[PDB]
Amino acid sequence: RLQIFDIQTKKMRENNMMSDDVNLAELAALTKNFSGAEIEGLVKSASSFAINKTTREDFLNALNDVTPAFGISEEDLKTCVEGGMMLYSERVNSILKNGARYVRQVRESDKSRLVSLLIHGPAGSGKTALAAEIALKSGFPFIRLISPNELSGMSESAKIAYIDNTFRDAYKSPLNILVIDSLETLVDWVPIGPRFSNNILQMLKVALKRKPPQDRRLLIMTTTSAYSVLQQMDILSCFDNEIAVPNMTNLDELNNVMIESNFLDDAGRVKVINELSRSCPNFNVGIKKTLTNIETARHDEDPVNELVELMTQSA
Amino acid sequence: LGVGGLDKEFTKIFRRAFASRIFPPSVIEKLGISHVKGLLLYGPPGTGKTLIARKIGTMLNAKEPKIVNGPEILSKYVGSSEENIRNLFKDAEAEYRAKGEESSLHIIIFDELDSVFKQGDNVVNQLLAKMDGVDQLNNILVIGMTNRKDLIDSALLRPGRFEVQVEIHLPDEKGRLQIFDIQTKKMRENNMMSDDVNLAELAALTKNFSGAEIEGLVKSASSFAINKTVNNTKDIAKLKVTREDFLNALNDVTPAFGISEEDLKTCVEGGMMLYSERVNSILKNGARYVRQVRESDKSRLVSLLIHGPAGSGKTALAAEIALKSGFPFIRLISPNELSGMSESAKIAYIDNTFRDAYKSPLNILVIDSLETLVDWVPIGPRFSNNILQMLKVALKRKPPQDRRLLIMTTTSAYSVLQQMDILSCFDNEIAVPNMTNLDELNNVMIESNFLDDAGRVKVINELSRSCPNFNVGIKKTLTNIETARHDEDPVNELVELMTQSA
Ligand SMILES: Nc1ncnc2c1ncn2[C@@H]1O[C@H](COP(=O)(O)OP(=O)(O)OP(=O)(O)O)[C@@H](O)[C@H]1O
Ligand SMILES: Nc1ncnc2c1ncn2[C@@H]1O[C@H](COP(=O)(O)OP(=O)(O)OP(=O)(O)O)[C@@H](O)[C@H]1O
Ligand SMILES: Nc1ncnc2c1ncn2[C@@H]1O[C@H](COP(=O)(O)OP(=O)(O)O)[C@@H](O)[C@H]1O
Numbered sequence: 053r054l055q056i057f058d059i060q061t062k063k064m065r066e067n068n069m070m071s072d073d074v075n076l077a078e079l080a081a082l083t084k085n086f087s088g089a090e091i092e093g094l095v096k097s098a099s100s101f102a103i104n105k106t107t108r109e110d111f112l113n114a115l116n117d118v119t120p121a122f123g124i125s126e127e128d129l130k131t132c133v134e135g136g137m138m139l140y141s142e143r144v145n146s147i148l149k150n151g152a153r154y155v156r157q158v159r160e161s162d163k164s165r166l167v168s169l170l171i172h173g174p175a176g177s178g179k180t181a182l183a184a185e186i187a188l189k190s191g192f193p194f195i196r197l198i199s200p201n202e203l204s205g206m207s208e209s210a211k212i213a214y215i216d217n218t219f220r221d222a223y224k225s226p227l228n229i230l231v232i233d234s235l236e237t238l239v240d241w242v243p244i245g246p247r248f249s250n251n252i253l254q255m256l257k258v259a260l261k262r263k264p265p266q267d268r269r270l271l272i273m274t275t276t277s278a279y280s281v282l283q284q285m286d287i288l289s290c291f292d293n294e295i296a297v298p299n300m301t302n303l304d305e306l307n308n309v310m311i312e313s314n315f316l317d318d319a320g321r322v323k324v325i326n327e328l329s330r331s332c333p334n335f336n337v338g339i340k341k342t343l344t345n346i347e348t349a350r351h352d353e354d355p356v357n358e359l360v361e362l363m364t365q366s367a
Numbered sequence: 368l369g370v371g372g373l374d375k376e377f378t379k380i381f382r383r384a385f386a387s388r389i390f391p392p393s394v395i396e397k398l399g400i401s402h403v404k405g406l407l408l409y410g411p412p413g414t415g416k417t418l419i420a421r422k423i424g425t426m427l428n429a430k431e432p433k434i435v436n437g438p439e440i441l442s443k444y445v446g447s448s449e450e451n452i453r454n455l456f457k458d459a460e461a462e463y464r465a466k467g468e469e470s471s472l473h474i475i476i477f478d479e480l481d482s483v484f485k486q487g488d489n490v491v492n493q494l495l496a497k498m499d500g501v502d503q504l505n506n507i508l509v510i511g512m513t514n515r516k517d518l519i520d521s522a523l524l525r526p527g528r529f530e531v532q533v534e535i536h537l538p539d540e541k542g543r544l545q546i547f548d549i550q551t552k553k554m555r556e557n558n559m560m561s562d563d564v565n566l567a568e569l570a571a572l573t574k575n576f577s578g579a580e581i582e583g584l585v586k587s588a589s590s591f592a593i594n595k596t597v598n599n600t601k602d603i604a605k606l607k608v609t610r611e612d613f614l615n616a617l618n619d620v621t622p623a624f625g626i627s628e629e630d631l632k633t634c635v636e637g638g639m640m641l642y643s644e645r646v647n648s649i650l651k652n653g654a655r656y657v658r659q660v661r662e663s664d665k666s667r668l669v670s671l672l673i674h675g676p677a678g679s680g681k682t683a684l685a686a687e688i689a690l691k692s693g694f695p696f697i698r699l700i701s702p703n704e705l706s707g708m709s710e711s712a713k714i715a716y717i718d719n720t721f722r723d724a725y726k727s728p729l730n731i732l733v734i735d736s737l738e739t740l741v742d743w744v745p746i747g748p749r750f751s752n753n754i755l756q757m758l759k760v761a762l763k764r765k766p767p768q769d770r771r772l773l774i775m776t777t778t779s780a781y782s783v784l785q786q787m788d789i790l791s792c793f794d795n796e797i798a799v800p801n802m803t804n805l806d807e808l809n810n811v812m813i814e815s816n817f818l819d820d821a822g823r824v825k826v827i828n829e830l831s832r833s834c835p836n837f838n839v840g841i842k843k844t845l846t847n848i849e850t851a852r853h854d855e856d857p858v859n860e861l862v863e864l865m866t867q868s869a
């Protein structure tokens with residue numbers, strides 16, 4: 053990419069129309085998966101800044117207007133899928149360190165060019181947020197997620213073609229990561245029949261075992277909440293490891309979350325725990341329920357007496 | 368003359384199709400016979416069917432053959448398609464009325480005939496009318512060429528229409544040696560070729576090549592020598608191609624009907640260690656089967672089913688046996704290749720693959736995920752019946768004319784198949800078990816150089832009383848071995864992962 057920058061900026065350099073503070077070497081590193089036309093567009097946008105004013109900052113600002121293919125889907129992953137992250141238990145830290153180890157292994161090994169992991173647990177635990185958070189810290193150039201929102205209102209034939217085209221594009225960068233969300237909902241599962249589409253299932257089953265070409269590598273993460281259903285369709289031999297995400301069952305974790313969420317002074321935080329000590333000592337709820345009950349209690353006239361009632365109802 | 372290889376398939380053609388034209392009309396009328404007016408040739412593409420016709424045309428001093436393309440005729444408009452047929456024979460019609468019996472021979476060539484039957488009738492009727500009906504013309508000879516003889520309707524093969532039929536095969540070692548001489552005569556005769564180039568050695572390296580590929584190889588070899596001087600510069604007096612040029616050129620042309628080595632090497636095999644006696648026994652049996660195939664006449668078809676627990680390592684043994692065999696033709700029909708195709712498309716693809724497999728002395732077919740191809744699901748159960756019968760029939764059929772292939776398929780649903788009643792198709796069964804002893808784990812850890820012996824013994828010490836009755840396949844064990852290598856505490860992580868997997 054350095055030579056492409058040289059070719060593009062030779063004309064600018066040759067007429068002393070370029071500042072001396074701009075270094076092309078750093079630009080050659082900032083643009084990680086750009087093409088020639090992308091560099092041309094970047095140069096044009098940067099020159100537009102100088103033209104409109106009547107430098108390095110011009111290029112740095114132009115970098116914010118051009119988004120390349122094979123880039124990072126920052127908005128979809130960051131905003132919707134992550135709305136808080138607090139270490140309420142040791143298991144979260146263990147899961148995060150294992151994920152980091154796997155991410156580093158994928159980058160620093162030749163034998164492992166394809167790793168697939170399955171994240172399953174009761175609904176509302178937070179599987180999807182962990183899946184996206186692990187990928188965000190990796191820093192790989194390419195990241196994409198497949199969720200039902202993309203396939204809504206489509207026919208089956210278009211669905212297969214779309215997924216196959218995405219997987220085809222996945223094999224054209226040094227590093228890739230893919231996320232799959234709510235596997236059961238993608239296949240249109242309803243238990244009365246049961247009813248579902250078999251072609252999509254077979255296509256996914258074939259895809260999940262294929263290896264990339266030319267010393268290339270990619271990582272796959274999937275999230276599910278129907279482990280038994282997947283057991284019925286005997287596709288458990290595709291994933292090389294599993295991770296379990298349980299719910300909360302101790303009052304200490306609830307206290308830690310309450311402290312992290314800035315509920316109120318310690319006086320009432322002690323009273324809530326004291327009441328729940330003998331109200332229902334064996335509650336079992338997820339993070340999503342608690343982080344919405346805390347939100348609900350804050351806006352009420354009697355937060356202490358309302359949060360306890362909500363906890364009793366949920367349990 | 369200009370044609371090498373085919374020797375016995377040319378004398379027979381000349382005996383029947385052309386031998387009569389030489390003699391004077393007097394003796395022919397004396398005998399009371401008639402000249403043959405049809406001829407059919409079939410074989411794999413790019414093997415030299417038109418060349419023999421053109422070269423045999425020159426001996427008789429006949430007019431230069433005309434050519435017609437079947438798809439071209441069919442694609443044009445209907446009116447022009449009907450009109451153009453009468454144009455081909457115009458010269459023959461004129462010269463016949465001009466001279467009579469003493470006219471010269473005219474030869475016409477027709478290519479891709481089967482395209483007309485693959486669906487058109489007007490052209491066939493007009494062709495037959497000019498050569499069989501009351502409009503008989505006694506100065507033409509029609510030659511038809513097709514790659515699939517079974518599709519031509521039997522009505523055309525009876526006497527009076529395409530009486531003689533011939534087949535063309537891929538060249539033998541002698542054929543490749545002769546075609547190389549035919550190609551390099553000009554270079555040899557003017558001293559532009561080195562003395563270190565040996566053709567007898569070149570003949571063996573190119574195994575399943577056709578004539579066009581040999582010509583392209585010569586072209587690339589010449590290009591290699593030419594490029595070495597440019598960058599035009601007057602030095603061209605000692606230009607002489609050499610062996611190294613052809614050896615480099617060999618790595619440039621990839622033939623059809625050839626080894627798909629990339630799929631065999633990259634995706635399937637990435638590690639192989641003999642940790643037990645059973646692996647050695649399996650490999651020995653595979654080698655024995657290969658040698659049985661190579662040096663026996665009674666066995667021309669062998670099919671095997673390798674079965675075991677999911678993730679046992681099935682796909683690795685098959686590819687390892689296949690690669691060491693050294694066969695000219697190796698191929699796989701797998702869900703990766705069939706992905707995204709329709710049902711009828713799948714049927715046609717499988718049929719075409721099997722037909723192509725019948726055109727080499729030795730072949731290997733690897734069918735991957737047999738239960739997945741049929742699209743089976745235990746819930747219904749659901750499956751496509753039509754594909755099942757195709758696969759059931761194809762697994763017993765024998766290749767024609769003393770050819771041989773080995774089919775191998777892998778599955779993990781032995782109960783489903785035995786229920787389906789298709790277990791009579793497979794000649795033999797092989798079972799690959801999982802690891803059940805810690806001494807095997809010790810060898811697995813040792814041969815991968817996981818870490819030093821001091822920490823090596825500790826893992827065994829811990830597993831001795833952690834969980835002595837583990838049962839895990841090679842894939843999961845080797846993945847855990849590698850995933851524990853990038854951690855701060857290899858021992859605890861490895862022990863916990865291996866215990867959890869069990
Ligand atoms: N440690 C944590 N792990 C997961 N989620 C957390 C954590 N701390 C806070 N949260 C909050 O939990 C909320 C619920 O998680 P998330 O949105 O990932 O749900 P989910 O498991 O994908 O949901 P569903 O099962 O309905 O598909 C997130 O908005 C996140 O803000
Ligand atoms: N001796 C061996 N036998 C089998 N596999 C081995 C051996 N040594 C190492 N391996 C590794 O085992 C891994 C598992 O192989 P493979 O994926 O083909 O198995 P499988 O049981 O057919 O898998 P699948 O679940 O896709 O059906 C391969 O990556 C190979 O690297
Ligand atoms: N035995 C042979 N000797 C020399 N050249 C051959 C031979 N067989 C095929 N060829 C090459 O094949 C080319 C023509 O083949 P082609 O007309 O395509 O036959 P078909 O169409 O029947 O496959 C020629 O360029 C010729 O050099």
Ligand SMILES: [Mg+2]
Nearest residue numbers: 234275276277
């Ligand atoms: Mg989910």
Ligand SMILES: [Mg+2]
Nearest residue numbers: 681682735777
């Ligand atoms: Mg396999």
